[PDB]
Amino acid sequence: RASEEQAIQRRLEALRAEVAFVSTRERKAQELYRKLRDELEELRLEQA
Amino acid sequence: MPAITTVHESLPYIDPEPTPEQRAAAEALIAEERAKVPDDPYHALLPPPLPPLNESRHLTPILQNELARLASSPDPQAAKMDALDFSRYEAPEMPSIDSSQSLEETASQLWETLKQAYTAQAYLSARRAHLALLDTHGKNAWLIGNWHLEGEVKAVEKELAETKREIDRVSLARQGMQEAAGAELKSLEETWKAGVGRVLETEAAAEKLRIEVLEERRRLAEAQAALAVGN
Amino acid sequence: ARVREELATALYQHDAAVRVIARLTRERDEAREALARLTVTGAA
Amino acid sequence: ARVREELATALYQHDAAVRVIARLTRERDEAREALARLTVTGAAPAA
Numbered sequence: 001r002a003s004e005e006q007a008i009q010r011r012l013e014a015l016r017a018e019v020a021f022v023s024t025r026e027r028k029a030q031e032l033y034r035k036l037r038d039e040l041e042e043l044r045l046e047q048a
Numbered sequence: 049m050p051a052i053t054t055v056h057e058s059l060p061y062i063d064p065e066p067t068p069e070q071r072a073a074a075e076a077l078i079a080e081e082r083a084k085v086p087d088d089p090y091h092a093l094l095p096p097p098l099p100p101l102n103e104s105r106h107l108t109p110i111l112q113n114e115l116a117r118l119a120s121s122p123d124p125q126a127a128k129m130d131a132l133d134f135s136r137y138e139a140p141e142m143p144s145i146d147s148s149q150s151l152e153e154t155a156s157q158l159w160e161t162l163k164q165a166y167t168a169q170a171y172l173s174a175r176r177a178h179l180a181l182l183d184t185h186g187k188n189a190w191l192i193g194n195w196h197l198e199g200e201v202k203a204v205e206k207e208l209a210e211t212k213r214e215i216d217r218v219s220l221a222r223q224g225m226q227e228a229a230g231a232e233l234k235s236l237e238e239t240w241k242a243g244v245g246r247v248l249e250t251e252a253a254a255e256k257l258r259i260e261v262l263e264e265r266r267r268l269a270e271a272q273a274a275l276a277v278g279n
Numbered sequence: 280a281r282v283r284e285e286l287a288t289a290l291y292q293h294d295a296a297v298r299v300i301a302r303l304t305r306e307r308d309e310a311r312e313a314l315a316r317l318t319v320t321g322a323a
Numbered sequence: 324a325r326v327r328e329e330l331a332t333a334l335y336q337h338d339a340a341v342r343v344i345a346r347l348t349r350e351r352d353e354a355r356e357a358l359a360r361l362t363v364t365g366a367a368p369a370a
Binding site for chain 1: 243
């Protein structure tokens with residue numbers, strides 16, 4: 001039971017770090033989407 | 049008390065039940081890396097070995113002799129003790145006095161028969177005295193002995209019941225705590241899988257939009273090249 | 280008594296190790312199968 | 324003596340098991356971190 005207590009704890013930090021990194025990379029994906037969307041709108045402005 | 053501090057990530061009340069086929073695969077694999085990993089006979093986690101009989105301060109040389117006898121006996125369960133002379137304890141018969149037997153020898157073997165008869169007489173008198181004592185005062189002693197024995201039974205029973213209550217308490221409390229943790233990990237795992245799928249779809253769509261923005265960059269480059277050629 | 284309690288601890292921790300083996304095997308199978316499927320497909 | 328021998332057998336099995344657990348722990352970390360950083364390359368059609 002003591003071993004499982006420590007196992008549960010370390011599994012919380014491991015999974016929390018993993019999901020936080022995935023969500024941060026998702027935020028970077030939306031930042032890249034915004035940058036490419038701004039570039040596309042700028043090329044629309046330059047063509048029009 | 050146990051002395052192993054190895055920690056596995058096994059949470060049985062919330063992890064799914066392992067199916068027997070990949071279970072048997074798990075013991076098969078654990079067996080094959082046990083085969084390739086050498087075994088350590090002097091591991092510190094192993095308790096010290098059982099000392100042999102001879103150097104032990106407990107067993108007397110008579111006890112090693114009896115242990116060797118009962119071990120050399122091929123059936124230890126049927127090994128028995130060298131019995132006393134119950135044939136001599138049995139009631140004596142009238143000895144056959146021979147006419148050719150000498151008077152001194154006849155008197156000596158009559159003396160031996162008298163010794164055995166008197167010993168049996170005293171033994172049987174003591175047995176009858178103890179039987180009368182058990183007749184007059186044995187039932188209350190039997191009652192008080194059975195009462196004490198069932199009292200010890202009750203003591204062992206309450207000890208085992210207390211230990212079982214401890215097990216029940218631990219199991220229920222950790223069922224609750226494990227279930228709370230398992231809900232947390234299930235939420236995080238599903239969120240992680242959904243985030244992986246979402247970021248893959250997101251970067252696929254972003255790569256497609258990168259293809260069109262590169263197409264428009266090439267369009268502007270071609271327009272600039274055409275204007276520079278025409279001017 | 281000491282050898283019996285240590286044996287019970289070893290048996291329970293061995294079953295725990297088997298359960299972790301099973302869970303990690305499922306994790307590896309899912310991750311490798313997903314990676315193989317995605318590398319085969321490409322256009323999700 | 325027999326239960327002591329079984330204890331030694333279980334000790335060897337548990338040591339082998341925890342070594343396999345460690346190896347598979349690095350294996351899961353490698354596979355999961357690799358799939359977590361799996362970017363999307365330009366899906367260029369076969370011209």
